[PDB]
């Protein structure tokens, strides 16, 4: 009940409190006959006559109303933190009336102690949180959350985001060339400012467009990060199973020793530990059948040869069937160059906006949205297969290219060229990293052309 | 089994393998001995329309 009235970060406290309850059960069970702890837990979690407990449901509720819209991912530290004040979307939770100390940690002093202990987990979301989330949700909880996140991403991509993409696409300049180096970086910066003025001035660009994209990005990051936690959880389970499943590590080999002749000797030492064979030797048919099934479940984990992030992306690409994303066929029968009718071009304009330096005491796009915004934008680009043309045709990348050449530094429309290109470089490094990662997980027929034909034949 | 079947839908094979850092060829290149032979202006006579 406490967890249901707090945010996702309080799940670490829930886990610690549950462990204290488990200990209390153990201590009491020495003298009393109580229901199994797991049976008690599932009943309280309403997970006996229902597929998903209260914990799993609340985790999803919090993802939907708090995590996705309010958190900013930091790829360098691998942690999420909360956004800025004006973007913090509050949702009032019904308070929980505290009970007597014995129903919590035991006493007032202990309540304080543990409360402080878990206070170090309230200001961010990272591996420790994900680790707990994995353990409490299990395969079935993680699966439903992933399925539900896909529905959220689909709702946003085919909904508000699509609407605003189609809107801004018309606000976009019909065509936009990349000026020759000759014009100079200052002039190029001025050219882009004019061509993309209506995107720069679009009132709901951040409050809506960036916000929606940040949510999609956070959803994607959650799927990736949760799978990684699950992999760590599985590998540790497997390490402890090894002894009972006849799995030995490589042994050292002195002179006159053969691993073949030694590994088999070691296997005899741990023979009494090989579970299945033992039960097949002394157990009843019922015991044997149950042992074979349990042994199968124990050795078969996702980390053994299965992954999800790939499927996640694959299904998201199917959410981008609207013709607006890819646009009409190119005039040259190959690819668009000057036209702004593909998404990555719109993203280039958006990138131009968030690369613009702000006041010393203003908050930046990274301080407000985190990396989630860019994970979304790059994901759409990659899934559309526009990452290569984006690299070539991006406005900011061009400005950076030219500025590095002429080394000029002015202030065009209150935009210090030097700082402008310094930020572009940062986002370039970030974009490359994300795109490379997406492409990596995303791991035939080539459109050929006809050579000139003699009018004769 | 029910829980695993539910998450199995969201999975696919991760095609990872394991090999060696360096794999030598089955047959190493044979050291050819140097033998002097005179310039021969006829070695291209069978290539295209040659002239003997």
């Amino acid at each position: 009940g406490r967890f249901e009235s707090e945010d996702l970060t309080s799940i670490v406290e829930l886990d610690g409190l549950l462990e204290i309850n488990r200990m209390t059960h153990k201590l009491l069970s020495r003298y009393l006959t109580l229901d199994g702890f797991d049976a008690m837990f599932r009943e309280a979690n309403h997970n006996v006559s229902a597929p998903y407990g209260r914990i799993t449901l609340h985790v999803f509720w919090e993802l939907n109303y708090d995590f996705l819209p309010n958190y900013c991912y930091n790829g360098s530290t691998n942690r999420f933190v909360r956004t800025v004040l004006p973007f913090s979307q509050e949702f009032q939770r019904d308070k929980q009336p505290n009970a007597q100390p014995q129903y919590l940690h035991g006493s007032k002093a202990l309540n304080l102690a543990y409360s402080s202990i878990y206070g170090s987990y309230r200001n961010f979301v990272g591996p420790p949180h994900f680790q707990v989330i994995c353990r409490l949700l299990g395969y079935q909880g993680i699966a439903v959350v992933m399925e539900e996140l896909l529905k959220v991403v689909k709702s946003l991509l085919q909904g508000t985001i699509l609407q605003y993409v189609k809107t801004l696409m018309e606000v976009m300049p019909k065509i936009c060339r990349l000026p020759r180096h000759e014009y100079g970086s200052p002039g190029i910066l001025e050219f882009f400012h004019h061509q993309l003025k209506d995107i720069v001035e679009y009132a709901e660009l951040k409050t809506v467009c960036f916000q929606n994209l940040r949510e999609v990005g956070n959803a994607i990051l959650f799927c990736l990060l949760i799978e990684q936690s699950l992999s760590l959880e599985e590998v540790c389970d497997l390490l402890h199973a090894a002894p009972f499943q006849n799995i030995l590590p490589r042994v050292h080999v002195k002179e006159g020793e053969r691993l073949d002749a030694k590994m088999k000797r070691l296997e005899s030492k741990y023979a009494p530990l090989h579970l299945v064979p033992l039960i097949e030797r002394l157990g009843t048919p019922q015991q044997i059948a149950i042992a074979r099934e349990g042994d199968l479940l124990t050795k078969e984990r996702l980390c053994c040869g299965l992954s999800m992030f790939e499927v996640i992306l694959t299904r998201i690409r199917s959410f981008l069937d609207d013709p607006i994303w890819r646009g009409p066929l190119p005039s040259n029968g190959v690819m668009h160059v000057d036209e702004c009718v593909e998404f990555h071009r719109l993203w280039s304009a958006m990138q131009f906006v968030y690369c613009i330096p702000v006041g010393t005491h203003e908050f930046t796009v990274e301080q407000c949205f985190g990396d989630g915004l860019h994970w979304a934008g790059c994901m759409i680009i990659v899934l559309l297969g526009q990452q290569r043309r984006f690299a070539v045709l991006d406005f900011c990348y061009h400005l950076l290219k030219v500025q590095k050449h002429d080394g000029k530094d002015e202030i065009i429309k209150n935009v210090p060229l030097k700082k402008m290109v310094e930020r572009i470089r940062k986002f370039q490094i970030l974009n490359d990293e994300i795109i490379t990662i997406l492409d990596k997980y995303l791991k035939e027929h080539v459109r050929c052309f006809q050579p000139p034909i003699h009018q004769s034949l | 089994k029910v829980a695993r079947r539910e998450i199995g839908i969201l999975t696919t094979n991760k095609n990872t393998s394991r090999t060696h850092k360096i794999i030598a060829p089955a047959n190493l290149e044979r050291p050819v001995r140097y033998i002097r032979k005179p310039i021969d202006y006829t070695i291209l006579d069978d290539i295209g329309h040659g002239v003997k």
């Binding site: 996702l302 040869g305 | 199995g8």
Partner: peptide, 8 residues
């Protein structure tokens, strides 16, 4: 090595 427990 297919994992039947995950419906494979």
């Amino acid at each position: 090595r297919s994992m039947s427990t995950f419906g494979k």
